[PDB]
Curated annotation (Swiss-Prot), chain D:
Transmembrane annotation, as ranges: none
Gene symbol of the encoding locus: UTP11
Subcellular location, principal: nucleus
Listed GO biological process terms: rRNA processing
GO cellular component, one term: nucleolus
Protein name listed in UniProt: U3 small nucleolar RNA-associated protein 11
Species this protein is from: Chaetomium thermophilum (strain DSM 1495 / CBS 144.50 / IMI 039719)
Keyword presence, Lipid metabolism: no
Cell compartment(s), UniProt: Nucleus, Nucleolus
Length: 96, 243, 57, 54, 46, 49, 102, 389, 33
RNA sequence: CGCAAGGCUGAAAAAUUGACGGAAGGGCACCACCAGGGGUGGAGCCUGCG
């Protein structure tokens, strides 16, 4: 995207919130809308229990995903200014 | 402390502070909204209470007791309002537990589960299960001992086994609502530990429920027992030689 | 309404919906006639005469 | 993955025992002991079916 | 009667779920792979 | 008093036949899985078809 | 007799299956009922729709034989279950209703 | 029990605003004057049944005389598979009885303006003997075609997109014997549930009425009826517009139960004039009398005269769809939205809607000149229950 | 009569979807192959 | 995406080969005759079917 390394976005809708199996990639993927350009791209939350911190209409930083749905390119790094792995590790509370 | 379902909790949500008693329920694997009995450590569970309605995606805080003599960290739970409804669909597992009475090759008679043939006729065709993993089906009510039935299993079950039927009984939350009118004064409903320590009743503990170490002997089976007519009829190159 | 296609039609004359097309004669039905008086309680009965030597009430 | 799970994610789930009012009937057969029982019976029936064919 | 009703409802519900999520995963994979291949083409030309 | 009192047999997870009253299953509304296909009863539309 | 033979004889009596009549025979028929009898034929020659005993009555009393319709009874009972039990299974958790006192 | 209303005027508007605002109402003295048939009408009690069916937790209580009801509303769930139906894609059946004189748009307009504020989808299926899909003489109800392509684009203006609205008829019917009866079944599927409707702005002049498209329908009569109606309507509107195009639709007859009968024999026409500017459309309808037998060219001239009347009269929205757009404007966010009504458009039903909103708790309306601009302040309620995932 | 609209205008008006307002053998090589 | 997807309309034939029989003569049948045997049906119990 763009010319930058990380993009910001709005979480439109957590697609695959009603998927059955817990660590499905359709369960982990989230449709976000990038601020700078306006397009809706899909991004992976790194973990299914870590999906619960991503709420609707939250400013979300996302980066590339460099390594079950092959081709979803982005991963959610920060949510509302706090790092998502820190939220998952219970280091910080999310400012809302 | 962990925080139990049924025990009251002071929610700060909207402009309202209100003490209500919630029901903690996990969304099992996105199928049935199964009722938990405690909140999970380090995990978001769903809660459900009877309070004022708020438009969703509204964050909230949640305390246990507005006391200054708490030695540490008065705020208990956080989160966000998911949705609002009337008549929620919370569901708790109820297992009807029985015992085998007579065991044939597949059909076993199962005794200490039901009380009458009316109850068995209601639960006809139900998916019964052994603790070991053997599936089975309730087939027919049994006449002469009232309350027993015939259930055809997958393979042969043992007399030591326990035969369970996993039904889902719905649980409705209670409709309690304290306002936390602090400037006027208010009665604060206590927790179950404070109630037990005050009115002197011990916590219920089942010795069959407390986990133990299981001494498993190494399973050795009997040798093969060939019948006499087959052992006398099979040919010379494969005849059994036993001194 | 008696036609040459060997049937008669009954229309309702508000909206002109066919009540029932009824094939009743073996040849092309020449004429039809209602009885005019409903003094006898039967004013919605009608005769039909056709080329197959028949009248039908 | 395996680094995206806590120690409480890794913690083992204990096995319940036979109830003490029913401990005289033997051990409570769970999936492992049932697998041993089923393996031995399928093996003995395979040998007996081959002997009946012969 | 409850057996027949519950089995009909379970078949219809499982078929509807399988159809809906096959559509969702196919559309997500299609859009994301299209944008990824377009970016790989625009990156290999540099 | 309700929170300190004993749980009902429906709220205990394992209800054997000694806990509850006699025909207490008929008053409950539970869901559970069945096994196998039921046999289709022959109805008049089936015989007509 | 056979069911085939008695069916053919009853339809020849009702004139549904007989020989191809000439126009003169049709003139005689138009010179000189059958649905009411065809209903009885289609009920009598399909006897498995309704449940009957074979022995007849045990003790003959004279005072002035279809004993039940299992197909119609099963369809009626299934309609009753569609109207009560399936409706309650749909409205498991449905609170409030219109309180019609009139 | 708390809020108090009187009279039988704008009954469905009062119940729907009570459901949407959550304010419990009590409507007294329905038919005090009528000695022959006092109390609730059959279409009114069937709308009460439909409201109980699609909501959840609502308690409706009709009195012994039938002349006072009270109504404590609940949440608009829709067709959830645990409470209302068995599957999420299953249509909730609603039967309305044979003694029903009002059209089905009398049920559809409150349901369509109560449907974007629901939790799940709405999949209502109106069957039964008394389901007339036509216009009525009645209280001059809209037809299904008039309702669809005249008022659902207004939801398209508000941001409830008509890509997901599925209103489909499976049989069509007029009244039949007298005003009572029907037979034609419909199903409406709202799958587009919004949080808050957009604050729209209808302010620019909708000057050039570009085209006229319409639907002439015949159920139970000959199919030359709509051709004669099209020639009459074109003979009136060809003085004014080069492109008037009216579809012809014909259905054989619907059958109701008594042993079934064929009912609903009639024919009607429904014109829609589309203005080139924006989502501005003027509609008019005319149906045959259910016993009369009038000329189809008379009906075509009558509907063309009504269409030219509404084109002469209306500022931006006609008075048939003005209560719907005004109550959605009131349901929107806490900003002002500006509608351009004509001075001839203002009606006692519109004025009664204003009185009901002021009684319920919405803000008043600001009326200024430009036809007059009415400006409505939203209350910011939206829908209460929606699973924010 | 000229009321017969078109298949496209029938598709927008008389369908179940309501109309939204926001729309307006040369050579021998090929022959041998 | 395009076609399918426009209502003289409104529920309940074929035959030179076909339709139905009759009379005579055969074959078979514990759903026939013949010779016997055995149930059920009388009292009580109860699955099931209505």
């Amino acid at each position: 995207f763009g010319g930058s390394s990380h993009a910001k976005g709005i979480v439109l809708e957590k697609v695959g919130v009603e998927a059955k199996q817990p660590n499905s990639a359709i369960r982990k993927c989230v449709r976000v809308q990038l601020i700078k350009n306006g397009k809706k791209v899909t991004a992976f939350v790194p973990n299914d229990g870590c999906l619960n911190f991503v709420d609707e209409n939250d400013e979300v930083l996302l980066a590339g995903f460099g390594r079950d749905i092959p081709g979803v390119r982005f991963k959610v790094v920060k949510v509302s200014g706090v790092g998502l792995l820190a939220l998952w590790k219970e280091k910080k509370e999310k400012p809302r | 402390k962990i925080l139990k379902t049924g025990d009251p909790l002071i929610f700060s949500l909207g402009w309202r502070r209100f003490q209500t008693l919630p029901i903690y329920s996990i969304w099992d694997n996105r199928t049935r909204n199964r009722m938990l009995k405690y909140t999970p450590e380090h995990m978001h569970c769903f809660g459900t209470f009877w309070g004022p309605l708020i438009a969703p995606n509204t964050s909230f805080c949640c305390f246990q007791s507005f006391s200054a003599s708490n030695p540490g960290f008065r705020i208990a739970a956080t989160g966000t309002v998911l949705s609002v409804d009337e008549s929620t669909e919370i569901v708790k597992k109820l297992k009807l537990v029985g015992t085998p009475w007579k065991i044939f090759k597949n059909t076993a008679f199962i005794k200490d589960m039901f009380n009458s043939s009316l109850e068995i006729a209601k639960f006809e065709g139900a998916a019964i299960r052994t603790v070991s993993g053997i599936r089975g089906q309730i087939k027919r009510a049994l006449s002469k001992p009232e309350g027993y039935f015939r259930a055809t299993f997958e393979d042969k079950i043992l007399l030591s086994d326990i035969v369970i039927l996993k039904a889902w009984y719905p649980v409705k939350p209670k409709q309690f609502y304290n306002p936390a009118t602090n400037l006027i004064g208010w009665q604060s409903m206590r927790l179950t530990g404070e109630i037990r320590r005050a009115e002197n009743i011990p916590t219920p503990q089942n010795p069959n429920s407390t986990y133990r170490k299981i001494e498993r002997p190494e399973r050795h089976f009997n040798p093969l027992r060939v019948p006499k007519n087959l052992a006398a009829e099979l040919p010379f190159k494969s005849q059994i030689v036993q001194t | 309404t008696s036609s040459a296609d060997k049937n008669i039609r009954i229309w309702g004359l508000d909206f002109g919906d066919c009540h029932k097309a009824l094939f009743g004669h073996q040849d092309s039905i020449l004429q039809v006639a209602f009885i005019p008086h409903n003094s006898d309680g039967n004013g919605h009965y009608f005769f039909s005469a056709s080329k197959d030597r028949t009248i039908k009430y | 993955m395996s680094s995206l799970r806590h120690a409480i994610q890794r913690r083992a789930h204990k096995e319940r025992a036979q109830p003490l009012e029913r401990q005289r009937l033997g051990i409570l057969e769970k999936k492992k002991d049932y697998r041993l029982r089923a393996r031995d019976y399928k093996k003995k029936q395979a040998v007996l079916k081959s002997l009946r064919q012969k | 009667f409850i057996r027949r009703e519950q089995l009909r409802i379970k078949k219809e519900k499982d078929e509807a779920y399988e159809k809906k999520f096959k559509r969702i995963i196919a559309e997500i994979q299609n859009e994301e792979g299209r944008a990824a291949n377009e970016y790989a083409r625009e990156k290999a030309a540099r | 008093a309700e929170l300190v009192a004993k749980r009902a047999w429906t709220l205990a997870g394992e209800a054997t036949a000694a806990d509850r009253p006699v025909n207490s299953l008929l008053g409950e509304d539970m869901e559970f899985d069945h096994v196998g296909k039921p046999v289709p009863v022959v109805t008049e539309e089936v015989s007509e078809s | 007799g056979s069911q085939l033979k008695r069916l053919k004889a009853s339809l020849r009596e009702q004139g549904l299956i007989g020989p191809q009549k000439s126009k003169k025979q049709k003139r005689q028929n138009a010179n000189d009922q059958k649905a009411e009898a065809l209903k009885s034929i289609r009920e009598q020659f399909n006897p498995f729709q309704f449940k009957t005993n074979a022995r007849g009555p045990k003790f003959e009393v004279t005072t002035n034989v279809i004993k039940g319709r299992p197909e119609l009874s099963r369809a009626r009972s299934e309609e009753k279950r569609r109207q009560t039990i399936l409706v309650e299974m749909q409205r498991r958790n449905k609170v409030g209703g219109i309180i019609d006192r009139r | 029990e708390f809020l108090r209303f009187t009279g039988h005027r704008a009954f469905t508007q009062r119940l729907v605003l009570a459901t949407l605002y959550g304010r419990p109402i009590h409507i007294s003295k329905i038919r005090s004057s009528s000695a022959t048939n006092p109390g609730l009408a059959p279409h009114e009690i069937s709308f009460l049944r439909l409201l109980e069916s699609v909501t959840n937790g609502s308690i409706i209580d009709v009195s012994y005389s039938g002349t006072t009801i009270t109504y404590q509303p609940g949440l608009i769930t829709g067709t959830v598979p645990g409470m209302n139906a068995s599957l999420s894609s299953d249509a909730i059946e609603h039967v309305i009885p044979a003694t029903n004189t009002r059209g089905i748009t009398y049920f559809l307009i409150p349901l369509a303006l109560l449907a974007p504020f629901s939790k799940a989808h709405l999949n209502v299926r109106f069957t039964g003997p008394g389901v007339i899909t036509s216009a009525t003489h009645g209280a001059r109800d809209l037809s299904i075609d008039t309702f669809r392509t005249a008022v659902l684009p207004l939801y398209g203006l508000f941001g409830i997109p008509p890509a997901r609205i599925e209103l489909r008829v499976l049989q069509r019917s007029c009244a039949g014997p007298g005003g009572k009866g029907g037979g034609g079944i419909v199903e409406m599927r709202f799958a587009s549930q919004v949080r808050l409707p957009k604050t729209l702005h209808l302010n620019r002049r909708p000057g050039k009425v570009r085209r006229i498209r319409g639907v002439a329908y015949c159920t139970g009569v000959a199919a030359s009826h709509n051709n004669r109606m099209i020639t009459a309507a074109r003979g009136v509107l060809n003085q004014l517009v080069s492109d008037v195009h009216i579809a012809a639709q014909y259905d054989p007859a619907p059958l109701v139960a008594e042993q079934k009968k064929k009912t609903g024999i009639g024919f009607g026409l429904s014109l829609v004039a589309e203005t080139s500017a924006e989502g501005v459309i003027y509609a008019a309808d005319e149906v045959a009398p259910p016993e009369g037998g009038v000329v189809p060219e008379d009906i075509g001239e009558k509907c063309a005269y009504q269409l030219l009347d509404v084109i002469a009269q209306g500022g931006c929205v006609m008075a048939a769809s003005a209560p719907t757009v005004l109550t959605l404007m009131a349901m929107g966010s806490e900003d002002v939205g500006r509608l351009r009504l004509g001075r001839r458009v203002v009606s006692p039903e519109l004025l009664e809607l204003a009185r009901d909103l002021k009684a319920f708790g919405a803000a008043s309306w600001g009326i200024r000149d430009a036809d007059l601009i009415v400006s409505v302040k939203g209350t910011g309620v939206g829908n209460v229950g929606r699973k924010v995932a | 009569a000229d009321g017969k609209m078109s298949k496209q205008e029938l598709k927008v008006y008389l369908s179940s979807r309501p109309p939204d307002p926001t729309r307006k053998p040369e050579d021998s090589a090929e022959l041998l192959a």
